[PDB]
Design an enzyme around this catalytic site. Structure first.
Site, PDB file in Angstrom:
ATOM      1  N   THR A 106       0.832  -1.196   0.000  1.00  0.00           N
ATOM      2  CA  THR A 106       0.000   0.000   0.000  1.00  0.00           C
ATOM      3  C   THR A 106       0.867   1.246   0.000  1.00  0.00           C
ATOM      4  O   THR A 106       1.439   1.614   1.023  1.00  0.00           O
ATOM      5  CB  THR A 106      -0.942   0.040   1.213  1.00  0.00           C
ATOM      6  N   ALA A 118      -9.204   0.399   5.295  1.00  0.00           N
ATOM      7  CA  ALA A 118      -9.863   0.785   4.054  1.00  0.00           C
ATOM      8  C   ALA A 118     -11.199   1.461   4.324  1.00  0.00           C
ATOM      9  O   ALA A 118     -11.467   2.555   3.807  1.00  0.00           O
ATOM     10  CB  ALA A 118     -10.051  -0.438   3.162  1.00  0.00           C
TER      11      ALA A 118
END
Lengths: 228, 62, 213, 239, 238, 201, 240, 232
Positions: free
Chosen positions: F1, F49
């Site tokens: 990420t 998220a």
């Protein structure tokens, strides 16, 4: 004899709602017309003096991108319903990821058209005109202080309501186009206003699926009036 | 051509003297109507006429 | 102590087609090492054109199913039309995030048609993130399904492989093969296999048994 | 607590307390104000001062931020709470979005507050009108007035208080675009407009300006006498 | 008339006037007729419009998968008891996982509209409900009132000049039991054609018909699925 | 990420990968991380998220109502301040949120960085995530204020390529955006397996 | 003037007019009587059918509060249903808390203090309902209590509430409470419920009967009015 | 109960508080009483006539102690008296819990006056119809205070309330004086209560309490009968 603020009439209905209906009559006029292409809309600002700046006055605020509005009567009562109706549309969009339909807005306002009382003060003194284009096409709506919400194809309000409706069923049919209706409103406005019609008195507002947005600017209206 | 049942049940608290005025008002409109014959619906028309009250209607009350 | 979570299992499968969507789930509801039942289908009819699957902890599947099937009819009572498949995803994101600080333990998969006759399978997580995907697989056998659908539908890591789109008959032997060959090594994948097909013409259901151990 | 609707609709459609409580606006001090293209000027008149006593505590032109000036009519007591609440509101706007307070935002605050102060249970509506003048960010000057209805409304110049029809009728003979081509014409324009106002003996005329980047300047009685001097000498030139 | 003031004050005759004035608000609404068979329930309403161009204000609104109600009188309070109606439906639908019978729903309307008829500063609800649905024992046609007194009838009608509808229904109540839907509906809206003056229609654009059945979920028809029902009626007599 | 944001002479460039794991297992390869807020704002995703999706979405609420009130599109620093005031009240409940806010303003280009702890700092360059420290290294060698458009695209794609190479938690697509004065515009989405053929030689 | 409006104001002669208006509001409603025998309590309510109005079994003024306690309401009807829900809830509290079935004395106190509790404020109005309470338990016996809108609760062998009130309680002293079985007392009620309210006022009527006691084994229920049909078999033979 | 909470005590067109004037008339309809401060302690005298020979004087007491050194009598109506009696009882004890010290009477009349004035303005009550006399011996100089339904508080040398308070006022203008003893205050107090009594005054009619500087002591009908024997 100041009695219960929530008391029925001998006829009878709500005293204070019936008194609230008469408060629309001294407000300024407006004209809505439903088109197959969109919704045109008209109002008069009612300039009081040449002291005042004419373009700061709002009679049309635009609720979402795709749902117009028109207010009447007492404006400062209308602003609260505007600002909260926007919150109800956004809450619809953030639970649902879709546009709130033009119908359910006026349920979401008219469910609190009547909240006055002492526990749990006065009803609102506005008569709104909602326009807009949802998936059901261009809808033109109308709500009152009583909450009695109904669709209206070509609605007038206010002081001019009687002569504007009465003169307005004569000039309306099912297959009206847009630029026909836009110059079909200002004839009625220049019949019903007391000041001379010019670039500072009125404002139009249109909303279409394919003409958007297409909001409301000056110098369009200069071309609009000079077509008379 | 009168059932007498419909005009009977629609009367609540209406005075007997007002019932005479029902056939009066129904007979007064017979002038402008041009026919002296009356119908059973004209009774309940003049019955609801004088009472409750007059002449207004319910708006603004939701 | 009283630990308020327990793992039940079950494995949900969804494949988005061109005009269809197949949602399938095993039925073995089991706690620990025992078997509570051999018939407990997970695929749930929400609307005519949207079928949800719910695995993980079972009581939250029941609770979540009942809250969703309530708010559907609240939307129908308000706005005179059914919820779109895109709206159920956002509403379920808000519901699954509404209990964030005492979370659900539920893996969700929503399949069903969109406005334009296409397969729109949405997937989730217990905290409530979501995305649109062509095919997903949750539950206890995700790692026994996902690279195989990549090898059959996703076409990853293959050279000189021409691309045919997924047909209606091919996806069925896909689902049958993945639940048999996945059910051989897994323990939480069980006897009866519910298969729901969502077409433009309604909801079709088909159930094929498997090995009985 | 206190559950009673004070302000209800009359059968001829009016609210009373809104459209009656403007009489307290009608029986207060007057205040005018014009906007120049560069420097604004507003001022209170009919001060009715004791003329042997203190004067800074009866000062009724104040600030919310330095960006925004005040002016009002009516009874000052109810105006004080509107001012302080307006200040507490316009400080948290600085805590948010880092531009200074635009004047239209703060006029929507006083107007919205005064509306819901009419709308609620057991509350007498405010009896003030007020002006809110300030040359905003990006240097543009404008003004608004309030209303006990709560309808903010942008003028080019002011007349509120006693004889608003007199001065408001007078400024139509002002609005030639020569006035104001100069800032000294704007200030002497305001004081010469307050000639038709109450006694205008150079005592009860308190004027204040704002030069579009400066903090507001309460002018001493120094050039007010000189503007009365060039105004009276101009009237000597008028014949 | 100083005891006509509030809902608290009893009369010296024993009739609380605010309830009577709210009954007057019931009578000012338009006509609607609900009548049942042994196997079905049909309620038929008549819309009115404000003007020609404005669409007719609807009456019959969908409530549950079997419960449907008509309305007359006020509209906002109809949305209020409508939302309470939905919420008390899907409460027990959420808890017991069965639909509610009608005969224990209406006690929540009586105990809901009771308290705003007793305590000070609370108006009653101008309301005109004609409730219809299935429990397991068949159809039911109820009516309400702002005094909260609900009546299990076989047929009623409320609204403007609705007494003529009743005096139609009494000479056919012996024949309103066996018949199926297609003549039951027109037996319904014959009462509506007696609620009107005898010189104007009886159009298609105004009448709305709602039916609840066993193999038939509660359904509202609007002018166009109504157009197959209005065909083939008798002429109004001379 | 790995997300990264840097402003230059022509607006603001944002780039990110698409891989979002769950433990050692990878949930999916196509998670669209750079969340679209308005036609003139761009927010990213880091750490959790659903937290970034939810709180940036709730930021879009107050931004849209703000535009509906003041008739002006909201400034970037205002959006960052509202987001920090929303995040800060839940300090001590365990939100993991490493977003960034990008957009054009009256003062020109704009960029801010919002942590779940309550950090709020403006800057020229940023990179957020597990592979972020792998992105500052190559990102700070080719960067200056004066770059061309294709040069900034090649830098902002190369840095994501080194991030998905060296780190294990970064992979998938390379989603590249571009912010300008007239509202943002998507550039491209190049897969890493195709980019290895490009930059490998 | 001014002394009748509010409930919380005494009148100068020394009574409360809103309570007195509440007493004669029940006076306009129809007659409903009750009586107990040595081992049971028999109710009877005459009900009004003019032409069509309602299906048989609508809005039954006989209620059922507990397993062994029932109502027989007369007056305004909606507030009587409110008292039915409240007395229902009070039997639920006693049943839940103290483990055994509610005696009729506590139930009469806890309801009558509410009916009194709405006669002390101008927040509410006094109720306009009056109701019977019949019951039977083997350690208790049959009790029959009577609550008026004022709040007075006490005990009858027999009572009557309605328009025809005095004429419908004139004849009860002819009957004997002490010896008779309630199975006689059913038709011994229905004879004068058929006799009182002569048919010139209202053309038709319809009868309800509810019967709790030793024969029903504590449970209160409506008798099957078709079963034994003892009412009109005696009542058509009771005109001469 | 409802939140009505509106003050029924408003201003007149002249500007006079009407309910306070009428409450002072209801003070004037009350029983007479007099209280005299004299140089070592304060003697309170009240006048209690039972309306019949059936009555018991042993039950109800008018001189009511508040601490072991503070007494309190009234001239007005008893049912409104006992409420602020109990309010003073609870109210002194928070001072004895916080500061751990015997509360000064000056502080008592401040606080009770705050209760009463604060009670004249609150939601929908009538004011109290009671005018108090509060005595006590704090820090070496014995005090005598009087409150009223207006919430005010005075510091009298030797006053009288109730019936004929202008008669007992002028009587206590001359006959009350510079300085006496404790027994000498009792003589003139029983005399000025003997100004407006009936034809006989026994141990059951009057009831007299004192404050020594060493502590309070309500007196018994033995000495109350012995002092009035000896007509005053």
């Amino acid at each position: 004899y100041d009695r219960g603020v929530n008391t029925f009439s001998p006829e009878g209905r709500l005293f204070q709602v019936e008194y609230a209906i008469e408060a629309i009559k001294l407000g300024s006029t407006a004209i809505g017309i439903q088109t197959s292409e969109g919704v045109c809309l008209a109002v008069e600002k009612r300039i009081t003096s040449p002291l005042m700046e004419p373009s700061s006055i709002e009679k049309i605020v635009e609720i979402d991108a795709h749902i117009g509005c028109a207010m009447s009567g007492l404006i400062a009562d209308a602003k609260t319903l505007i600002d909260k109706a926007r919150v109800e549309t956004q809450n619809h969009w953030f639970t649902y990821n879709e546009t709130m339909t033009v119908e359910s807005v006026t349920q979401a306002v008219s469910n609190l058209a009547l909240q006055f009382g002492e526990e749990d003060s006065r009803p609102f003194g506005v008569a709104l005109l909602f326009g807009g284009v949802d998936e059901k096409g261009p809808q033109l709506f109308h709500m009152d202080p009583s909450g009695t919400f109904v669709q209206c194809d070509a609605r007038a309000i206010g002081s001019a309501s009687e002569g504007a409706q009465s003169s307005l069923q004569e000039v309306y049919h099912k297959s009206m186009t847009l630029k026909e209706a836009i110059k079909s409103s200002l004839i009625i406005l220049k019949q019903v206003m007391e000041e001379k019609l010019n670039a500072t008195n009125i404002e139009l507002a249109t909303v279409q699926p394919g003409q958007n947005f297409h909001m409301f600017t000056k110098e369009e209206l200069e071309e609009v009036i000079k077509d008379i | 051509d009168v059932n007498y049942e419909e005009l009977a049940r629609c009367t609540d608290d209406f005075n007997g003297a007002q019932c005479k005025a029902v056939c009066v008002e129904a007979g007064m409109i017979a002038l402008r109507r041009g026919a002296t014959e009356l119908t059973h619906e004209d009774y309940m028309e003049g019955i609801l006429e004088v009472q409750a009250k007059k002449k207004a209607n319910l708006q603004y009350y939701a | 102590r009283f630990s308020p979570y327990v793992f039940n299992g079950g494995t949900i499968l969804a494949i988005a087609g061109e005009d269809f969507a197949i949602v399938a789930s095993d039925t073995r509801l089991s706690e620990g090492f025992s078997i509570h039942t051999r018939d407990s289908p997970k695929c749930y009819k929400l609307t005519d054109k949207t079928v949800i699957g719910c695995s993980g902890f079972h009581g939250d599947c029941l609770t979540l199913t009942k809250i969703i099937e309530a708010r559907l009819k609240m939307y129908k009572h308000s706005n005179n039309k059914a919820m779109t498949t895109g709206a159920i995803a956002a509403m379920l994101s808000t519901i699954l995030y509404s209990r964030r600080f005492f979370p659900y333990y539920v893996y969700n998969i929503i399949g069903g048609l969109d406005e334009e006759g296409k397969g729109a399978v949405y997937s989730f997580d217990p905290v409530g993130s979501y995305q649109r995907d062509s095919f997903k697989a949750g539950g206890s056998a995700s790692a026994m399904l996902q690279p195989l659908l990549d090898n059959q539908v996703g076409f990853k890591n293959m050279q000189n492989v021409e691309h045919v789109p997924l047909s209606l008959d091919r996806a069925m032997r896909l689902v049958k093969d993945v639940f048999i060959s996945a059910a051989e090594r897994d323990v939480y994948t069980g006897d009866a296999l519910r298969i729901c097909i969502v077409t433009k013409e309604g909801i079709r259901e088909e159930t094929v048994s498997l090995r009985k151990d | 607590s206190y559950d009673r609707a004070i302000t209800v609709f009359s059968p001829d459609g009016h609210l009373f307390q809104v459209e009656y409580a403007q009489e307290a606006v009608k029986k207060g001090s007057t205040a005018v104000g014009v906007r120049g293209r560069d420097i604004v000027v507003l001022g209170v008149e009919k001060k009715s001062v004791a003329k042997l006593q203190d004067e800074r505590t009866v000062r009724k032109i104040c600030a919310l931020d330095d960006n925004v000036c005040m002016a009002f009519a009516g009874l000052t007591a109810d105006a004080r709470i509107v001012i302080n609440r307006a200040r507490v509101e316009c400080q948290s706007h600085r805590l948010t979005v880092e531009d200074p307070v635009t004047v239209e935002y703060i006029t929507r605050y006083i107007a919205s507050l005064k509306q819901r102060y009419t709308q609620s249970n057991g509350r007498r509506p405010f009896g003030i009108s007020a002006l809110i003048v300030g040359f905003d960010f990006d240097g543009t000057p404008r003004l608004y007035q309030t209303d006990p209805s709560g309808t903010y409304h942008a003028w080019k110049a002011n007349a509120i208080g006693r004889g608003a029809k007199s001065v408001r009728e007078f400024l139509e003979k002002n609005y030639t675009d020569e006035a104001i081509e100069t800032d000294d014409l704007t200030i002497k324009l305001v004081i010469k407009a307050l000639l038709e106002v109450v006694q205008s003996g150079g005592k009860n005329i308190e004027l204040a300006v704002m030069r579009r980047d400066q903090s507001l300047k309460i002018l001493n009685p120094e050039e007010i006498e000189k503007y009365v001097a060039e105004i009276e000498k101009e009237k000597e030139e008028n014949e | 008339n100083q005891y006509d003031n509030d809902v608290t004050v009893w009369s010296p005759q024993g009739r609380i006037h605010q309830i009577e004035y709210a009954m007057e608000a019931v009578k000012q609404g338009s006509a609607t007729v609900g009548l049942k068979s042994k196997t079905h329930a049909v309620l038929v309403a008549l819309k009115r419009a404000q003007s020609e161009l404005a669409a007719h204000q609807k009456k019959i609104l969908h409530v549950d998968n079997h419960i449907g109600i008509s309305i007359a009188g006020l509209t906002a309070d109809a949305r209020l008891l409508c939302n309470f109606m939905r919420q008390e439906c899907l409460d027990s639908r959420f808890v017991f996982d069965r639909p509610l019978p009608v005969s224990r729903l209406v006690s929540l309307i009586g105990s809901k509209t009771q308290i705003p008829t007793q305590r000070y500063g609370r108006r009653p609800y101008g309301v005109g409900l004609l409730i219809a649905g299935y429990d397991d024992m068949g159809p039911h046609i109820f009516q309400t009132c702002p005094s909260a007194n609900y009546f299990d009838c076989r047929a009623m009608s409320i609204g403007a000049r609705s007494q003529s509808a009743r005096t139609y229904l009494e000479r056919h109540m012996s024949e309103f039991m066996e018949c199926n839907l297609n003549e039951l509906v027109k037996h319904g809206l014959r009462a509506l054609r007696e609620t009107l003056p005898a010189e104007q229609d009886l159009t298609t654009k105004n009448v709305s018909i709602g039916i609840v059945g066993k193999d038939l979920e509660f359904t509202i028809y609007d002018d166009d699925d109504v157009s197959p029902f209005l065909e083939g009626l008798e002429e109004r007599p001379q | 990420t790995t997300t990264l944001a840097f402003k230059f002479r022509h607006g603001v460039i944002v780039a990110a990968d698409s891989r979002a794991t769950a433990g050692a297992y990878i949930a999916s390869q196509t998670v669209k991380k750079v969340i679209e807020i308005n036609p003139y704002l761009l927010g990213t995703m880091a750490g959790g998220a659903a937290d970034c999706s939810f709180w940036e979405r709730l930021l879009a609420r107050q931004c849209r109502i703000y535009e509906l009130r003041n008739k002006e599109r909201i400034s970037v620093a205002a959006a960052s301040k509202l987001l920090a005031n929303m995040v800060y009240q839940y300090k001590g409940m365990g939100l993991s949120m490493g977003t960034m806010i990008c957009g054009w303003d009256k003062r020109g280009p704009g960029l801010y960085y919002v942590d779940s702890e309550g950090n709020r700092i403006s800057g020229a360059t940023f990179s957020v995530g597990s592979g972020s420290v792998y992105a500052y290294g190559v990102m700070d060698r080719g960067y200056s204020y004066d770059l061309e458009v294709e040069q900034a695209y090649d830098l902002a794609r190369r840095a994501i390529y080194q991030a998905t190479y060296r780190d294990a938690y970064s992979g998938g697509a390379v989603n590249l955006y571009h912010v300008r004065e007239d509202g943002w515009i998507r550039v491209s989405s190049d897969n890493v397996a195709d980019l290895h053929e490009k930059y490998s030689g | 003037t001014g002394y009748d409006l509010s409930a919380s104001t005494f009148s100068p002669d020394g009574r409360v007019f809103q309570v007195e208006y509440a007493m004669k509001a029940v006076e306009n409603s129809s007659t409903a009587i009750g009586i107990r025998c040595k081992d049971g309590v028999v109710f009877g309510v005459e009900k009004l059918v003019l032409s069509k109005l309602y299906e048989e079994g609508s809005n039954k003024r006989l209620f059922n509060v507990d397993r062994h306690v029932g109502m027989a309401v007369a007056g305004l009807l909606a507030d009587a249903r409110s008292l039915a829900d409240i007395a229902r809830e009070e039997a639920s509290n006693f049943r839940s808390n103290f483990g055994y079935n509610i005696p009729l004395k506590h139930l009469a106190d806890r309801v009558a203090m509410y009916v009194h509790a709405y006669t002390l404020y101008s927040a509410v109005r006094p109720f306009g309902c009056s109701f019977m309470l019949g019951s039977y338990s083997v350690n208790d016996g049959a009790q029959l209590y009577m609550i008026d809108p004022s709040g007075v609760s006490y005990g009858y062998w027999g009572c009557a509430i309605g328009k025809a009130r005095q004429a419908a309680k004139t004849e009860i002293e002819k009957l004997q409470m002490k010896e008779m079985t309630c199975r006689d007392i059913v038709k011994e009620v229905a004879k004068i419920i058929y006799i009182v309210h002569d048919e010139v006022k209202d053309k038709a009527f319809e009868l309800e009967l509810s019967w709790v006691g030793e024969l029903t084994n504590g449970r209160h229920e409506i008798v099957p009015k078709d079963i034994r049909e003892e009412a009109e078999k005696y009542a058509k033979e009771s005109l001469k | 109960e409802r939140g009505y909470s509106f003050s029924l005590t408003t201003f007149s067109p002249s500007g006079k508080l009407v309910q306070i004037e009428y409450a002072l008339a209801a003070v004037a309809g009350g029983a007479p009483s007099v209280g005299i401060k004299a140089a070592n302690g304060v003697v309170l005298a009240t006048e209690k006539k039972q309306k019949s020979i059936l009555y018991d004087e042993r039950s109800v007491h008018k001189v009511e102690p508040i601490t072991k050194h503070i007494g309190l009598v009234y001239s007005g109506m008893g049912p409104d008296y006992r409420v602020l009696v109990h309010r003073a009882r609870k109210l002194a004890q928070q001072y004895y819990l916080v500061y751990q010290e015997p509360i000064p009477t000056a502080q008592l009349v401040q606080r009770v006056a705050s209760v009463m004035q604060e009670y004249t303005q609150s939601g929908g009550v009538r004011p109290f119809g009671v005018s108090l006399l509060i005595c006590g011996w704090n820090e070496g100089r014995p005090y005598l205070f009087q409150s009223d339904p207006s919430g005010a508080y005075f510091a009298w040398k030797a006053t009288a309330m109730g019936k004929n308070y202008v008669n007992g006022k002028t009587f206590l203008e001359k006959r009350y004086n510079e300085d006496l003893e404790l027994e000498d205050a009792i003589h003139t107090a029983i005399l000025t209560l003997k100004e407006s009594f009936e034809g006989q005054m026994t141990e059951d009619n009057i009831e007299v309490g004192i404050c020594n500087e060493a502590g309070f002591r309500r007196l018994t009908p033995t000495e109350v009968k012995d002092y009035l024997a000896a007509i005053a």
